[PDB]
Symmetry: D4
Subunit: 138 residues, 8 copies
Amino acid sequence: AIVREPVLTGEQAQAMVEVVMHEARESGHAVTVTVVDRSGQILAVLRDHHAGVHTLNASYKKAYTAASQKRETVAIARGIRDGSIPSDIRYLDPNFSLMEGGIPIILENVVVGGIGVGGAHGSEDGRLARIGLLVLQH
Amino acid sequence: TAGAIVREPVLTGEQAQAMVEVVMHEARESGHAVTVTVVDRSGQILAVLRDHHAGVHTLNASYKKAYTAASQKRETVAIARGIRDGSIPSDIRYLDPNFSLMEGGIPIILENVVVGGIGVGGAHGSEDGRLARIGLLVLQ
Amino acid sequence: TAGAIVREPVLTGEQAQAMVEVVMHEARESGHAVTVTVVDRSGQILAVLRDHHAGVHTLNASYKKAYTAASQKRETVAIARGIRDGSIPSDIRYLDPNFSLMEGGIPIILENVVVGGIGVGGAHGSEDGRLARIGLLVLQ
Amino acid sequence: AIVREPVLTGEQAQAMVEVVMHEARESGHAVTVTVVDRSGQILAVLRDHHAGVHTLNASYKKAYTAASQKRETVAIARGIRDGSIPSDIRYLDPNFSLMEGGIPIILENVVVGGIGVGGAHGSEDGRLARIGLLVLQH
Amino acid sequence: TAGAIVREPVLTGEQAQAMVEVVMHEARESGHAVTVTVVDRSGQILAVLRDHHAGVHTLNASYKKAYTAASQKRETVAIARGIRDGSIPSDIRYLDPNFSLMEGGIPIILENVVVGGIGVGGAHGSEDGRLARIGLLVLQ
Amino acid sequence: TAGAIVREPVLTGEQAQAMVEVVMHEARESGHAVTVTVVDRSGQILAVLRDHHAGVHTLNASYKKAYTAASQKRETVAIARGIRDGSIPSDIRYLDPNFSLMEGGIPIILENVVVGGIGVGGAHGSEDGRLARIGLLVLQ
Amino acid sequence: AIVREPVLTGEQAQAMVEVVMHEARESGHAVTVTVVDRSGQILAVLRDHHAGVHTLNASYKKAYTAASQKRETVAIARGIRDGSIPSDIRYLDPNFSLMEGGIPIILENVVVGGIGVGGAHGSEDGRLARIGLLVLQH
Amino acid sequence: AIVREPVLTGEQAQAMVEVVMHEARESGHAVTVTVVDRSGQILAVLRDHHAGVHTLNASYKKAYTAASQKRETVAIARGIRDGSIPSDIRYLDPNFSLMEGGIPIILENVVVGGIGVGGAHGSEDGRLARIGLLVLQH
């Protein structure tokens, strides 16, 4: 039969990046935020004019990784460090980043995409990404 | 800004698998050595089957056609005809490195939503299209 | 050899964000499913918004148009017309893998300096250009 | 003179991926399985609609690696860990993955391709890949 | 589903080596600076020899021709002629990034099975084809 | 098989530097915003200078022209003219991803040996060629 | 309103690479020096005819990395080694190099690009890059 | 003035690969040997029909690395291991491999290219590469 599941909308992606960039302004950070769809393809990007261009790749990779692994990128890093996850996870996919700041996006229990932030270093990247995610509480 | 949760059909792995299986059966019965590729709605592979006597280029050909049909929401043969009749600019060829405007890609539609694409390469022209259409039949 | 420090306008993240927001609003009001991309003057993305019903190719299409307009300092539609009228050699198509000579990219200018480019894909031809122009209006 | 060797057929590749996806259903995992030919080029791929897109790369890389190295990817990982294999093996080829789940395919003592599975983590990836391989017992 | 074990000829490293050696000898005797490339049936290199006075582009040219001939199972010159006479759509050019539809690639056949391809670049047109054919002679 | 040691001229870093310096001086005096690129005989960069008002595409344009001229051992403008007059097949465009058959690349020759290539982009057509030629003058 | 900031000029990039190559001559090293703009795109490259072609990539990556991270590449290496920076910083961007020899270029307190040197190994690469940077004192 | 230096000829590259493949036959190994020019661009490749396709990349990367670094790839590996070479050398260039089997080619004291072998594992790769190099004694 035909399976129906939530799909992450352009409007939802836009709302997330807008909130993240507002918070990044407030905290004085120069970042990029990226939201990807279920299959890792971009729905939204916003970059600050003082954010280095690496933050485009950092944020995309984190979003992609979280969307595909269905776990926060920080958790994967923690898992390699404590020996529970093989370190070769790093090389599984050229779009992988295990730096903190990627979070999976779930709607009605289905993974529908990912959000990633780069430019503020790990802790703040994670804090900002979470603020984006929380726009979609349901 | 965010709006409501939107739910849409999803092309399942089982559906993609059934499509490639029926296409390969028809290709063998018809005398063609092909690759058939099914992609999701974002152009990412769900299924590939290649005949060992199909050239490796058919991996690229079938993928590109499937990608193109999914993204353009049109059959690749229709785009080819639009380029020829001047209704579509020829520079469409260079818009995306995964584009192929050769016959054999068809969008996959469930409940009026484009959920993916199917592409076939190796059967030359019209037979790639016929084979791709065979794949769609398994969803009916 | 080095000369003096030169200061020029910078397209801000806020400006790029405002541009993509207004373009997406207009696209939805107009009946188009698009991606809009804004790049800095070196062709590196500042902002992207994509409609979930816009094909993934529109990511590439909009980026390429934005890149092309920023680098060439001309609207992509003007380049397309120059190729057609013979004033621009067709091999311009192959000069850079990020080039698209299809309508919908426009340079972004502040205080007479090209500071970036905007590109739109998914609305077919003239509407991509109209939408890109809407983005420029937010800077005025 | 002219050397003749087995060649992995499309039918064989198809049979392997079908069995793997059946078993993955039964075990409740969302994976991709990929089979490659002797020269690392795809013959078959099947992905579950809940499997992240990284599993395309993971499964391909594992299949490619096993086909070219003529050993299971898990064995290479084990060998780096115990110091018998130099760690720079990781960077020899951009298609390499030393994550468990790639197995070489042998017919009549000749390496004819590789099978790889990604999406279930190492142990289950290996279990699933083996089920695929066993279709070709002779 | 799996069927029987199928055995086919394999182009050996010794055969590929002999082919490139004879082609380079003929090229030097003929006044050409070339690269000759032999690929296996999946388009992966078995042998390359380049003259130090052959431009590096001849690495790409010879590889692409060898790949194309192996995958298409036809001489690249035959494909070029089909594009010109309208029997082959020109978009074949974009189906695979390793395609070259310029003369100089020929499929390698052993016991009626395509086992690889040979390509030559640097001798311009018909001489690339003649040189590629010289390589085939060593298998007889 | 190996033969004798062969010695040939080498384009030095100092020579490549002098070439790009003189080209940039002439470009500024002439009213052009360009990139000039010099490559070694294997197509690998020795020198690049870009004007901050030259679009980033000129990095690719100048490199491709320099590469093409070094590898083909001909001026890119001569290749462009050969395509137009039918003496060179148009598929030369797809032989190598670093090819540009637009005017502005010239081979660099020392003691009758091609030792590299120079390419210029950003000055449109004939001025790219004139600027590239200025670079050659510093070797005399 | 409209923000105005310094932009690294072609003339400035040229002056930097000329000075670096003069010093490299004097010290007997075969290097490449690369200068990139604010967004990591090349403004200048000079390579010695005895410098290996890897120095093109080395110098570019170092320049890019320094421009985007706003810190010297040597500092990032030091930070991974002492545990203050997560090692996965290495994989954030395919243009990253944490080898010594990249330095950010600042004009009037704004990061406007990066300079990188490769071919002399770390210490000398750093020394040469600094000589380039010092051309722009203000 | 005009500098003249040796250039590695096609004939020299051919002679090297022929000797290596003869020795590989004799030793029962399935390898690829690659010779690159001064700027890392291929002059010769020979692969055995039982050598995995990764050996194309392995041999090229080793040849490229040795040509550009002007030292054997085994030496670089040794140097990272003993702490004399920073480990980030691995990421300087996408064509780098620090696996044993790459050797620089020198003519009249000038580095003119590199030879690399892959498929026999490190020690034998190095032994085979050396046999190739020795064709050019002068």
